[PDB]
C-alpha cells in the first residue's frame, strides 16, 4: 500500500507565524495521466469529521483560507500556514487518493507556544461518602501549567505507589494555551485507613526540583 | 442537499454485529460510492472500503474483510456498514463519506462495545480545607465515579463557573468510567456546588462543596 509518512506528531506554533507541516509517501501519487499529485489535505478538530482543505496537492477547497498552501511532487509534500491563527490550531493528516487502499497518515498537531507555567498542585483525600462505599480515591489536580510534559508520583508514607492510579490529561487551553491534568489513585476504605500520608509528586519543567504535596490521613 | 445523516452512537454487546445506517439527500447513492471510515478513539483516521453502487462495485481494506459487509439500499438512499462479532477494538467512530477526492463527511455515530448496563454515576466532592491564618488560595472539585454509558455533564453553580473550571477525561475503569472536575475560586465562604448530569440512568445531582 501508499504508506503516509507525516512528522512530527506534533509541532509547536507561535501565534502569526508561518508553520510548515510535511509529509512523504512510498510509492508516487503522481498520476501521470493528469499530471496532477493525488494527495489531499485534511484537518480534524475534536468532535468534528475531517475538513478537506487542498486536493491535487496543492489545489485549495471551496472556503479554505488563502493562508492555506498545498505543495509537493512526488512523494515529498508540504502544508504550509502562514499567519497561524488559532483557528488552525487542529490535527493535520495527508491522505492518498491516489491508490487503493487509501492510506492517511498519522498527523501533525499545533499547540501554541504559551510560556511555561508551573502546575498548581493540589490533593484531596477521600470524601466522607468515598468510604461507605467500600473505596478511596485521593485525586489530585495539576492544573495550568507549560510545556505539556509532567510526571506526576504517588506514594502511602513514603513509599511508592504506582497502582491503582487514572491520569486524565487535557488538551491545550483555549484562553491560557495551557495543561491541566488529573491523577487519581483509588484505594479500598482498609488500604485507606491502614495508612496515614499520601503525597502528590509533580516533576515538571517549570522547576529545578519536584513539586510536592502531601496530606496526611491525620490533619483538621 | 449533500448530506450524510448518521446516527451519532450505538452501544452494542460484545461479540454481537452491528448494521450502521447512512441516509444520504441532495444526490442519488446509486449514481456514486458512498465510503466509510473508521476513527478510533485519540487515535488516526482509517479506511474500510467503500460501496461503489452504480458499477455494483464494492472494495474493502484486507485489515476488514469479514467484519466489514458494506452494502447499500438504493431505494431508501442508505449506505450500510455491518459490523460482525464485535470486540473493543471495534469501538471507535464510524465515518460515511465521500473522501478524485471530494469532501463529505457525515455526523459519524460512536460505537462503544460493552457488556456493561447502564448504571448511575457516583458523586463524591473533593473539599479541600487548608486555612492558614487568610493566608490561602482556592480550588475544589468533583468526582464522577463509574457509570454507563458515557457521557455525563458537569457544571458549577448552574453556569457562573467556567473560567477556573476544568473538566478532565472520564477515564475507563472496566466498563465504567470517572471524570473528575476543578474549579478555582478565589477566597469567599458561601457555596460552591457541582452539578451532575446524566442523561441515559435519568440521574441529576448537584453536590454541594462543604468544606472538610
Known amino acids: 500500500d501508499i504508506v503516509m509518512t507525516q512528522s512530527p506528531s506534533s509541532l509547536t506554533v507561535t501565534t502569526g507565524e508561518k508553520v510548515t507541516m510535511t509529509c512523504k509517501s512510498s510509492?508516487?501519487?503522481?498520476?501521470?495521466?493528469?499530471?496532477?499529485?493525488?494527495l489531499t489535505w485534511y484537518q480534524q478538530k475534536p468532535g468534528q469529521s475531517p475538513k478537506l482543505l487542498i486536493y491535487?496537492?496543492?489545489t485549495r477547497e471551496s472556503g479554505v483560507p488563502d493562508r492555506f498552501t498545498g505543495s509537493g511532487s512526488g512523494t515529498d509534500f508540504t502544508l504550509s500556514i502562514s499567519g497561524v491563527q488559532a483557528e488552525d490550531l487542529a490535527v493535520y493528516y495527508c491522505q492518498n487518493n491516489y491508490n487503493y487502499p487509501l492510506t492517511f497518515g498519522a498527523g501533525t498537531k499545533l499547540e501554541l507556544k504559551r510560556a511555561d507555567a508551573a502546575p498548581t498542585v493540589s490533593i484531596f483525600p477521600p470524601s466522607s461518602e468515598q468510604l461507605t462505599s467500600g473505596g478511596a480515591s485521593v485525586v489530585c489536580f495539576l492544573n495550568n501549567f507549560y510545556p505539556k510534559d509532567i510526571n506526576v508520583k504517588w506514594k502511602i508514607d513514603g513509599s511508592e505507589r504506582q497502582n491503582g492510579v487514572l491520569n486524565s490529561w487535557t488538551d491545550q487551553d483555549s484562553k491560557d494555551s495551557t495543561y491541566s491534568m488529573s491523577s487519581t489513585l483509588t484505594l479500598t476504605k482498609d488500604e485507606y485507613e491502614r495508612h496515614n500520608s499520601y503525597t502528590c509528586e509533580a516533576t515538571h519543567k517549570t522547576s529545578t526540583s519536584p513539586i510536592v504535596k502531601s496530606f496526611n490521613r491525620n490533619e483538621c | 442537499e449533500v448530506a450524510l445523516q448518521q446516527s451519532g452512537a450505538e452501544l452494542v454487546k460484545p461479540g454481537a454485529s452491528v448494521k450502521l445506517s447512512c441516509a444520504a439527500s441532495g444526490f442519488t447513492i446509486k449514481d456514486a460510492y458512498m465510503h466509510w471510515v473508521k476513527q478510533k478513539p485519540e487515535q488516526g483516521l482509517e479506511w474500510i472500503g467503500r460501496i461503489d453502487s452504480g458499477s455494483s462495485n464494492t472494495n474493502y481494506d484486507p485489515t476488514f474483510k469479514g467484519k466489514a459487509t458494506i452494502t447499500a439500499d438504493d431505494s431508501s438512499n442508505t449506505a450500510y456498514l455491518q459490523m460482525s462479532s464485535l470486540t473493543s477494538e471495534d469501538t471507535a467512530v464510524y465515518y460515511c463519506?465521500?473522501?478524485?477526492?471530494?469532501?463529505?463527511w457525515g455526523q459519524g455515530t460512536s460505537v462503544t462495545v460493552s457488556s456493561a448496563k447502564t448504571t448511575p454515576p457516583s458523586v463524591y466532592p473533593l473539599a479541600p480545607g487548608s486555612a492558614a491564618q487568610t493566608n490561602s488560595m482556592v480550588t475544589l472539585g468533583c468526582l464522577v465515579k463509574g457509570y454507563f454509558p458515557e457521557p455525563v455533564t458537569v457544571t458549577w453553580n448552574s453556569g457562573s463557573l467556567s473560567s477556573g473550571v476544568h473538566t478532565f477525561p472520564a477515564v475507563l475503569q472496566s466498563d465504567l468510567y470517572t471524570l473528575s472536575s476543578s474549579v478555582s475560586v478565589p477566597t469567599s465562604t458561601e457555596t460552591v456546588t457541582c452539578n451532575v448530569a446524566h442523561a441515559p440512568s435519568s440521574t441529576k445531582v448537584d453536590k454541594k462543596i462543604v468544606p472538610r
Open positions: 463519506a465521500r473522501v478524485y477526492a471530494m469532501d463529505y
Open positions: 510509492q508516487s501519487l503522481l498520476n501521470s495521466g493528469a499530471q496532477k499529485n493525488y
Open positions: 491535487w496537492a496543492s
